Amino acid sequence: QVQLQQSGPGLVKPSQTLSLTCGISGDSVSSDAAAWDWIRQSPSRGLEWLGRTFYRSRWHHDYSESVKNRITINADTSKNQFSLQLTSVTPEDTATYYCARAGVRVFGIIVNSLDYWGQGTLVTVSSASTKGPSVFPLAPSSTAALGCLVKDYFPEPVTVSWNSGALTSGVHTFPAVLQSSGLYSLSSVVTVPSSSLGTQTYICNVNHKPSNTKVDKKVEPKSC
């Protein structure tokens, strides 16, 4: 596959500028068979195409009417990347932003279907401050369930692993909920054999990149 690696901060204050980058491996950003798109997705508006850059005899730009006069998409040939800049953002621009490659060969031509996608960047438009989570154990009861409560952080997202990624079976990490404080909270749980509770260690690894927070919490039976 062509690999698309997204980077850039998610949190943008109202009226300021969203800036994201998409690094390309396995194709050249200048290829005359490719086009490079930005797409965003939100619960309200679904999937929306934002714009496109591509090189033929020169560089071309095509942008959506929905972001008229606010969008710039530039390619960097030396770094083999392309970028998105969206100015004067409002809460309507809160969304998950994807880069993508347009172009599939069929019928001896190229149709502009999106064969490869970046991983997505959640972009939150808000004036509020970043805050890292507190992490609390959900201790197994004295066949068994245990977990971590990941409470009071902003903005989304957090990632949770178990035993540094070794433990995946039986894990459920719930979608976060926005509390009345304006801070998010979620829990991550896992079911494990009851017989393991004394001898197998269980540690949840919580990463909240916007606050540079990394927390490991060991989850063990409550003593007394």
Binding site: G46, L47, E48, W49, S64, Y98, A100, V104, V106, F107, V111, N112, S113, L114, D115, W117, G118, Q119, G120, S134, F136, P137, L138, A139, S141, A145, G147, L149, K151, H172, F174, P175, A176, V177, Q179, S185, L186, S187, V189, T191, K222
Partner: protein, 209 residues
């Protein structure tokens, strides 16, 4: 400028069912219709392009047809892994999506209750968590009772997306009280009503026990 609609907007179908999803365009075009499949936490994945050409590696139970302004995606024998939202695309426009859920036999939740940690109580707040694990259908009734007094307005629920292997859901309900309010009561109970249970399941603890 073209606009796309999709029908149905959502559906629930059993494993092995033939599933048909339609995409309608507001006008004819020179562009070629593509179908995408999007699973939770992931980018959309291209399944079909040029209306009927299957992307390499996609199972042959997926097929696309149609012409003019009316197009169809057919799944000949729905599988658990086919839980997803399916989107059509024409020129630069995406359809609104069709959410496909797998209908399976009833599965009762396994229920667990967690008291607040001592660490959190020092901070002045108490979170009590009730977990409903691996159940179907998604609908469930969770009631918090504190000293047998029904709670209202102090809890929040969250539900996982349908599991791609066993087609179940899990759910958390979190009761939040101040440390002071938590300390004025003894019996904390989560009572679960669900189609898979012939009578409600209650899990409880006594604060300090």
């Amino acid at each position: 400028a073209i606009q796309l609609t999709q029908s149905p907007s959502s559906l629930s179908a059993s494993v092995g069912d033939r599933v048909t999803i339609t995409c309608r365009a507001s006008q004819a075009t020179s562009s070629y219709l593509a179908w995408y499949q999007q699973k939770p936490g992931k980018a959309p994945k291209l399944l079909i392009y040029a209306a009927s050409t299957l992307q390499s590696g996609v199972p042959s139970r997926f097929s696309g047809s149609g012409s003019g302004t009316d197009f169809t995606l057919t799944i000949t024998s729905l599988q658990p892994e086919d839980f997803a939202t399916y989107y059509c695309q024409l020129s630069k426009t995406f359809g609104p999506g069709t959410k496909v859920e797998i209908k399976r036999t009833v599965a009762a939740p396994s229920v667990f209750i967690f008291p607040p940690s001592d660490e959190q109580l020092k901070s002045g707040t108490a979170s009590v968590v009730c977990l409903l694990n691996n159940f179907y259908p998604r609908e469930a009734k969770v009631q918090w009772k504190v000293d047998n007094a029904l709670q209202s307005g102090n809890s929040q629920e969250s539900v996982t997306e349908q599991d791609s292997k066993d087609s179940t859901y899990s759910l958390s309900s979190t009761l939040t009280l101040s440390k002071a309010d938590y300390e004025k009561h003894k019996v904390y109970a989560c009572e679960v009503t669900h189609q898979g249970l012939s009578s409600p399941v209650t899990k409880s603890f006594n604060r300090g026990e």
